[PDB]
mmCIF file of C-alpha atoms and ligand atoms in Angstrom:
data_model
loop_
_atom_site.group_PDB
_atom_site.id
_atom_site.type_symbol
_atom_site.label_atom_id
_atom_site.label_comp_id
_atom_site.label_asym_id
_atom_site.label_seq_id
_atom_site.Cartn_x
_atom_site.Cartn_y
_atom_site.Cartn_z
ATOM 1 C CA UNK A 4 35.817 -34.849 67.167
ATOM 2 C CA UNK A 5 34.193 -35.736 63.664
ATOM 3 C CA UNK A 6 31.195 -38.148 63.322
ATOM 4 C CA UNK A 7 30.092 -39.074 59.940
ATOM 5 C CA UNK A 8 26.644 -39.228 59.127
ATOM 6 C CA UNK A 9 25.169 -39.922 55.724
ATOM 7 C CA UNK A 10 21.904 -39.797 54.194
ATOM 8 C CA UNK A 11 19.613 -42.401 54.756
ATOM 9 C CA UNK A 12 19.041 -45.563 52.699
ATOM 10 C CA UNK A 13 18.156 -47.782 55.376
ATOM 11 C CA UNK A 14 14.467 -48.523 54.311
ATOM 12 C CA UNK A 15 15.241 -48.270 50.617
ATOM 13 C CA UNK A 16 15.825 -51.626 48.514
ATOM 14 C CA UNK A 17 17.330 -52.050 44.821
ATOM 15 C CA UNK A 18 15.027 -53.492 42.487
ATOM 16 C CA UNK A 19 16.271 -56.826 40.861
ATOM 17 C CA UNK A 20 16.592 -54.927 37.308
ATOM 18 C CA UNK A 21 19.552 -52.633 38.511
ATOM 19 C CA UNK A 22 21.969 -55.352 39.738
ATOM 20 C CA UNK A 23 22.992 -55.444 36.107
ATOM 21 C CA UNK A 24 24.294 -51.704 36.332
ATOM 22 C CA UNK A 25 25.592 -51.895 39.505
ATOM 23 C CA UNK A 26 28.297 -54.654 38.315
ATOM 24 C CA UNK A 27 29.503 -52.394 35.277
ATOM 25 C CA UNK A 28 29.469 -49.340 37.012
ATOM 26 C CA UNK A 29 31.968 -51.081 39.795
ATOM 27 C CA UNK A 30 34.487 -52.253 36.931
ATOM 28 C CA UNK A 31 35.116 -48.925 35.232
ATOM 29 C CA UNK A 32 35.664 -47.587 38.590
ATOM 30 C CA UNK A 33 38.835 -49.825 39.020
ATOM 31 C CA UNK A 34 40.231 -49.094 35.697
ATOM 32 C CA UNK A 35 40.407 -45.245 36.642
ATOM 33 C CA UNK A 36 42.163 -46.353 40.303
ATOM 34 C CA UNK A 37 44.978 -48.047 38.349
ATOM 35 C CA UNK A 38 45.388 -45.858 35.523
ATOM 36 C CA UNK A 39 46.152 -42.924 37.974
ATOM 37 C CA UNK A 40 48.648 -45.093 40.161
ATOM 38 C CA UNK A 41 50.589 -45.921 37.028
ATOM 39 C CA UNK A 42 50.898 -41.790 36.356
ATOM 40 C CA UNK A 43 52.009 -41.865 40.140
ATOM 41 C CA UNK A 44 54.919 -44.159 39.729
ATOM 42 C CA UNK A 45 53.731 -48.077 41.604
ATOM 43 C CA UNK A 46 55.231 -51.236 40.329
ATOM 44 C CA UNK A 47 54.549 -54.704 40.864
ATOM 45 C CA UNK A 48 54.903 -57.335 43.605
ATOM 46 C CA UNK A 49 53.639 -60.054 45.259
ATOM 47 C CA UNK A 50 54.854 -58.804 48.763
ATOM 48 C CA UNK A 51 54.000 -54.907 49.407
ATOM 49 C CA UNK A 52 56.987 -52.464 49.800
ATOM 50 C CA UNK A 53 55.985 -48.455 50.070
ATOM 51 C CA UNK A 54 59.524 -47.730 49.043
ATOM 52 C CA UNK A 55 60.086 -50.068 45.735
ATOM 53 C CA UNK A 56 56.629 -48.850 44.478
ATOM 54 C CA UNK A 57 55.327 -52.414 43.980
ATOM 55 C CA UNK A 58 51.527 -53.317 44.871
ATOM 56 C CA UNK A 59 49.556 -56.749 44.445
ATOM 57 C CA UNK A 60 45.913 -55.318 43.465
ATOM 58 C CA UNK A 61 47.105 -53.620 40.372
ATOM 59 C CA UNK A 62 45.461 -56.624 38.434
ATOM 60 C CA UNK A 63 42.569 -57.354 36.405
ATOM 61 C CA UNK A 64 38.935 -57.240 38.399
ATOM 62 C CA UNK A 65 38.806 -61.417 38.531
ATOM 63 C CA UNK A 66 41.960 -62.081 40.651
ATOM 64 C CA UNK A 67 41.268 -59.491 43.244
ATOM 65 C CA UNK A 68 40.488 -61.187 46.844
ATOM 66 C CA UNK A 69 37.030 -61.904 48.041
ATOM 67 C CA UNK A 70 37.712 -60.033 51.258
ATOM 68 C CA UNK A 71 38.543 -56.610 49.244
ATOM 69 C CA UNK A 72 36.125 -57.170 46.118
ATOM 70 C CA UNK A 73 33.221 -56.573 48.513
ATOM 71 C CA UNK A 74 33.791 -53.247 49.947
ATOM 72 C CA UNK A 75 33.666 -51.610 46.169
ATOM 73 C CA UNK A 76 30.680 -53.996 45.630
ATOM 74 C CA UNK A 77 29.016 -52.654 48.526
ATOM 75 C CA UNK A 78 29.483 -49.065 47.898
ATOM 76 C CA UNK A 79 28.586 -49.175 43.881
ATOM 77 C CA UNK A 80 25.439 -49.922 45.633
ATOM 78 C CA UNK A 81 25.089 -47.126 48.058
ATOM 79 C CA UNK A 82 25.439 -45.080 45.276
ATOM 80 C CA UNK A 83 22.644 -45.912 43.369
ATOM 81 C CA UNK A 84 20.502 -46.323 46.462
ATOM 82 C CA UNK A 85 21.321 -42.866 47.772
ATOM 83 C CA UNK A 86 19.760 -41.937 44.575
ATOM 84 C CA UNK A 87 16.082 -43.153 45.306
ATOM 85 C CA UNK A 88 16.351 -41.060 48.879
ATOM 86 C CA UNK A 89 16.282 -37.682 47.210
ATOM 87 C CA UNK A 90 12.907 -38.480 45.519
ATOM 88 C CA UNK A 91 14.450 -39.247 42.058
ATOM 89 C CA UNK A 92 14.437 -42.569 39.766
ATOM 90 C CA UNK A 93 16.320 -44.192 36.986
ATOM 91 C CA UNK A 94 14.758 -45.637 34.023
ATOM 92 C CA UNK A 95 15.819 -46.425 30.726
ATOM 93 C CA UNK A 96 15.251 -44.574 27.473
ATOM 94 C CA UNK A 97 18.168 -44.758 24.923
ATOM 95 C CA UNK A 98 18.195 -48.811 23.178
ATOM 96 C CA UNK A 99 21.221 -47.441 21.135
ATOM 97 C CA UNK A 100 23.525 -47.888 24.069
ATOM 98 C CA UNK A 101 26.096 -51.038 24.303
ATOM 99 C CA UNK A 102 27.340 -50.670 20.834
ATOM 100 C CA UNK A 103 27.800 -46.975 20.871
ATOM 101 C CA UNK A 104 31.071 -47.497 23.169
ATOM 102 C CA UNK A 105 35.076 -47.842 23.857
ATOM 103 C CA UNK A 106 37.706 -48.410 25.734
ATOM 104 C CA UNK A 107 40.744 -46.192 26.323
ATOM 105 C CA UNK A 108 43.932 -47.019 24.392
ATOM 106 C CA UNK A 109 47.093 -46.214 26.491
ATOM 107 C CA UNK A 110 50.925 -46.539 25.056
ATOM 108 C CA UNK A 111 52.847 -49.661 25.836
ATOM 109 C CA UNK A 112 54.443 -48.277 28.823
ATOM 110 C CA UNK A 113 51.310 -48.061 31.179
ATOM 111 C CA UNK A 114 51.753 -52.489 30.969
ATOM 112 C CA UNK A 117 53.207 -58.701 34.208
ATOM 113 C CA UNK A 118 50.258 -58.915 31.371
ATOM 114 C CA UNK A 119 47.587 -56.493 33.142
ATOM 115 C CA UNK A 120 47.103 -52.941 31.682
ATOM 116 C CA UNK A 121 43.990 -50.684 33.193
ATOM 117 C CA UNK A 122 41.726 -49.455 30.427
ATOM 118 C CA UNK A 123 39.062 -47.559 31.064
ATOM 119 C CA UNK A 124 36.049 -46.981 29.094
ATOM 120 C CA UNK A 125 36.311 -43.500 26.536
ATOM 121 C CA UNK A 126 33.286 -41.503 28.472
ATOM 122 C CA UNK A 127 34.204 -37.814 27.282
ATOM 123 C CA UNK A 128 31.722 -36.602 24.668
ATOM 124 C CA UNK A 129 28.767 -37.184 27.409
ATOM 125 C CA UNK A 130 27.418 -33.528 28.889
ATOM 126 C CA UNK A 131 25.121 -33.267 32.309
ATOM 127 C CA UNK A 132 22.412 -30.636 32.638
ATOM 128 C CA UNK A 133 22.764 -27.851 35.334
ATOM 129 C CA UNK A 134 20.214 -30.075 37.559
ATOM 130 C CA UNK A 135 22.574 -33.332 37.279
ATOM 131 C CA UNK A 136 25.766 -31.187 37.992
ATOM 132 C CA UNK A 137 24.503 -29.734 40.965
ATOM 133 C CA UNK A 138 23.383 -32.968 42.045
ATOM 134 C CA UNK A 139 27.182 -35.057 41.622
ATOM 135 C CA UNK A 140 28.167 -32.033 44.221
ATOM 136 C CA UNK A 141 25.586 -33.199 46.865
ATOM 137 C CA UNK A 142 26.336 -37.220 45.926
ATOM 138 C CA UNK A 143 30.244 -36.497 46.806
ATOM 139 C CA UNK A 144 30.228 -35.132 49.930
ATOM 140 C CA UNK A 145 27.711 -38.212 50.902
ATOM 141 C CA UNK A 146 30.549 -40.625 49.690
ATOM 142 C CA UNK A 147 33.077 -39.287 51.907
ATOM 143 C CA UNK A 148 30.640 -39.951 55.011
ATOM 144 C CA UNK A 149 29.880 -43.337 53.820
ATOM 145 C CA UNK A 150 33.879 -43.754 53.704
ATOM 146 C CA UNK A 151 34.223 -41.993 56.943
ATOM 147 C CA UNK A 152 31.406 -43.819 58.685
ATOM 148 C CA UNK A 153 33.018 -47.687 57.700
ATOM 149 C CA UNK A 154 36.614 -46.612 59.182
ATOM 150 C CA UNK A 155 35.513 -45.247 62.731
ATOM 151 C CA UNK A 156 33.903 -48.992 63.056
ATOM 152 C CA UNK A 157 36.815 -50.837 61.996
ATOM 153 C CA UNK A 158 38.781 -48.783 64.545
ATOM 154 C CA UNK A 159 41.190 -46.244 62.593
ATOM 155 C CA UNK A 160 41.660 -42.643 64.028
ATOM 156 C CA UNK A 161 43.201 -39.600 63.232
ATOM 157 C CA UNK A 162 47.328 -38.783 62.593
ATOM 158 C CA UNK A 163 50.021 -37.038 60.885
ATOM 159 C CA UNK A 164 51.608 -40.179 59.009
ATOM 160 C CA UNK A 165 49.833 -43.265 57.926
ATOM 161 C CA UNK A 166 50.639 -46.365 59.410
ATOM 162 C CA UNK A 167 49.982 -50.201 58.369
ATOM 163 C CA UNK A 168 50.600 -51.189 61.841
ATOM 164 C CA UNK A 169 49.030 -48.346 63.479
ATOM 165 C CA UNK A 170 45.699 -47.471 62.159
ATOM 166 C CA UNK A 171 45.531 -44.468 61.329
ATOM 167 C CA UNK A 172 45.067 -41.449 58.653
ATOM 168 C CA UNK A 173 45.639 -37.997 58.182
ATOM 169 C CA UNK A 174 42.415 -37.166 56.081
ATOM 170 C CA UNK A 175 39.758 -38.018 59.115
ATOM 171 C CA UNK A 176 38.084 -34.716 58.945
ATOM 172 C CA UNK A 177 34.890 -32.988 57.793
ATOM 173 C CA UNK A 178 34.590 -32.208 54.064
ATOM 174 C CA UNK A 179 34.691 -28.369 55.019
ATOM 175 C CA UNK A 180 38.150 -29.119 56.489
ATOM 176 C CA UNK A 181 39.071 -31.387 53.486
ATOM 177 C CA UNK A 182 41.854 -30.316 51.010
ATOM 178 C CA UNK A 183 40.588 -29.352 47.518
ATOM 179 C CA UNK A 184 43.449 -31.651 45.911
ATOM 180 C CA UNK A 185 40.990 -34.371 47.931
ATOM 181 C CA UNK A 186 37.778 -32.821 47.595
ATOM 182 C CA UNK A 187 38.019 -32.566 43.942
ATOM 183 C CA UNK A 188 39.014 -36.212 43.445
ATOM 184 C CA UNK A 189 35.893 -36.601 45.268
ATOM 185 C CA UNK A 190 33.769 -35.233 42.886
ATOM 186 C CA UNK A 191 35.540 -36.520 39.872
ATOM 187 C CA UNK A 192 34.800 -40.352 41.112
ATOM 188 C CA UNK A 193 30.699 -39.275 40.615
ATOM 189 C CA UNK A 194 31.069 -37.463 37.300
ATOM 190 C CA UNK A 195 32.599 -41.062 35.883
ATOM 191 C CA UNK A 196 29.482 -42.764 37.931
ATOM 192 C CA UNK A 197 26.684 -40.674 36.546
ATOM 193 C CA UNK A 198 28.263 -40.660 33.070
ATOM 194 C CA UNK A 199 28.775 -44.815 33.358
ATOM 195 C CA UNK A 200 24.734 -44.461 33.940
ATOM 196 C CA UNK A 201 23.721 -42.277 31.206
ATOM 197 C CA UNK A 202 26.664 -44.585 28.827
ATOM 198 C CA UNK A 203 24.368 -47.570 29.012
ATOM 199 C CA UNK A 204 21.291 -45.714 28.652
ATOM 200 C CA UNK A 205 19.537 -44.592 32.099
ATOM 201 C CA UNK A 206 17.914 -41.272 32.950
ATOM 202 C CA UNK A 207 17.824 -39.622 36.100
ATOM 203 C CA UNK A 208 14.175 -38.034 36.807
ATOM 204 C CA UNK A 209 12.087 -37.644 40.067
ATOM 205 C CA UNK A 210 9.635 -40.870 40.838
HETATM 206 N N1 ADP B 301 38.637 -44.926 45.053
HETATM 207 C C1 ADP B 301 38.369 -46.175 45.149
HETATM 208 N N2 ADP B 301 37.250 -46.502 43.912
HETATM 209 C C2 ADP B 301 37.889 -47.725 43.773
HETATM 210 N N3 ADP B 301 38.415 -48.528 44.420
HETATM 211 C C3 ADP B 301 39.059 -48.463 44.998
HETATM 212 C C4 ADP B 301 39.648 -47.080 45.412
HETATM 213 N N4 ADP B 301 40.443 -46.738 46.176
HETATM 214 C C5 ADP B 301 41.110 -48.226 46.225
HETATM 215 N N5 ADP B 301 40.163 -49.340 45.580
HETATM 216 C C6 ADP B 301 40.612 -50.198 45.366
HETATM 217 O O1 ADP B 301 40.922 -51.193 46.427
HETATM 218 C C7 ADP B 301 41.695 -52.136 46.765
HETATM 219 C C8 ADP B 301 42.945 -52.158 47.525
HETATM 220 O O2 ADP B 301 43.198 -50.713 47.701
HETATM 221 P P1 ADP B 301 44.800 -50.570 48.184
HETATM 222 O O3 ADP B 301 45.569 -51.184 46.650
HETATM 223 O O4 ADP B 301 45.637 -51.271 49.357
HETATM 224 O O5 ADP B 301 45.028 -49.034 48.043
HETATM 225 P P2 ADP B 301 45.302 -48.156 48.966
HETATM 226 O O6 ADP B 301 47.162 -48.287 49.234
HETATM 227 O O7 ADP B 301 45.837 -46.690 48.355
HETATM 228 O O8 ADP B 301 45.160 -47.674 50.195
HETATM 229 C C9 ADP B 301 41.910 -52.043 45.244
HETATM 230 O O9 ADP B 301 41.728 -53.353 44.466
HETATM 231 C C10 ADP B 301 41.711 -50.935 44.723
HETATM 232 O O10 ADP B 301 41.141 -50.601 43.088
HETATM 233 O O1 U1C B 302 41.420 -41.883 51.764
HETATM 234 C C1 U1C B 302 40.481 -42.083 51.275
HETATM 235 C C2 U1C B 302 39.829 -43.037 50.541
HETATM 236 N N1 U1C B 302 38.354 -42.355 49.877
HETATM 237 N N2 U1C B 302 37.596 -43.596 49.082
HETATM 238 C C3 U1C B 302 36.929 -44.898 49.596
HETATM 239 C C4 U1C B 302 36.662 -45.483 48.489
HETATM 240 C C5 U1C B 302 37.618 -46.630 48.779
HETATM 241 C C6 U1C B 302 36.487 -47.579 47.098
HETATM 242 C C7 U1C B 302 35.271 -46.616 47.326
HETATM 243 C C8 U1C B 302 34.108 -46.861 45.933
HETATM 244 C C9 U1C B 302 33.191 -45.721 45.775
HETATM 245 C C10 U1C B 302 32.461 -45.920 45.055
HETATM 246 C C11 U1C B 302 32.447 -47.188 44.155
HETATM 247 N N3 U1C B 302 31.287 -47.857 43.435
HETATM 248 O O2 U1C B 302 30.698 -46.501 42.668
HETATM 249 O O3 U1C B 302 31.274 -48.197 42.433
HETATM 250 C C12 U1C B 302 33.243 -47.903 44.677
HETATM 251 C C13 U1C B 302 34.514 -48.408 45.598
HETATM 252 O O4 U1C B 302 35.478 -45.532 48.352
HETATM 253 C C14 U1C B 302 38.206 -40.975 50.375
HETATM 254 O O5 U1C B 302 37.057 -40.733 50.423
HETATM 255 N N4 U1C B 302 39.283 -41.002 51.434
#
């Protein structure tokens, strides 16, 4: 059996000036999911058929249900709140941001009206201490996801099931396939690069 216990963010709070960056981080994380699903062969619909490859939650940020969108906004908060728990703080330095950025231009077949478009964050490099940081944050994000699922009643099986709460990935990070392990680490790379793209520096407090 496996129990997830991430780092403690219970005593920390997020200053009001950090909520502005929280809304933009959660936006760009959604466009990456739509693109990686179009690359995986999912079409559109208003009812959910796994064999037909049609799913309703492939539209813009504005029309998703309020029940589902809260999970994304809270996990954008815990990521910024966990950085304060490591003895570091983020401070805005560079004013030449928000006009120096652009979104990706994809071909016409990625389009129902909606077409995903993440930001172009490719010429943004990190220092070693910042890259060792993304290694620690990725394993914590798995533990935060793991702790919510145990409380919601989902256990481990061999086959995922929409009628019987069950998912095969209910394992420690050490018993995790590198194909999944990587995708958790790549999500934090876009998270840290999203902060630098708007002008935030990560230093000790
Ligand atoms: N790794 C992720 N990062 C951000 N948002 C995610 C992620 N995985 C799923 N979501 C969001 O969760 C919502 C519902 O997910 P859903 O389409 O039911 O996913 P799945 O079928 O893969 O479980 C979608 O709006 C999607 O954008
Ligand atoms: O099967 C699975 C799925 N999964 N990842 C769980 C996802 C679902 C959405 C989020 C999420 C993360 C970060 C932000 N953010 O920062 O904005 C917003 C939302 O975590 C996993 O680890 N094994």
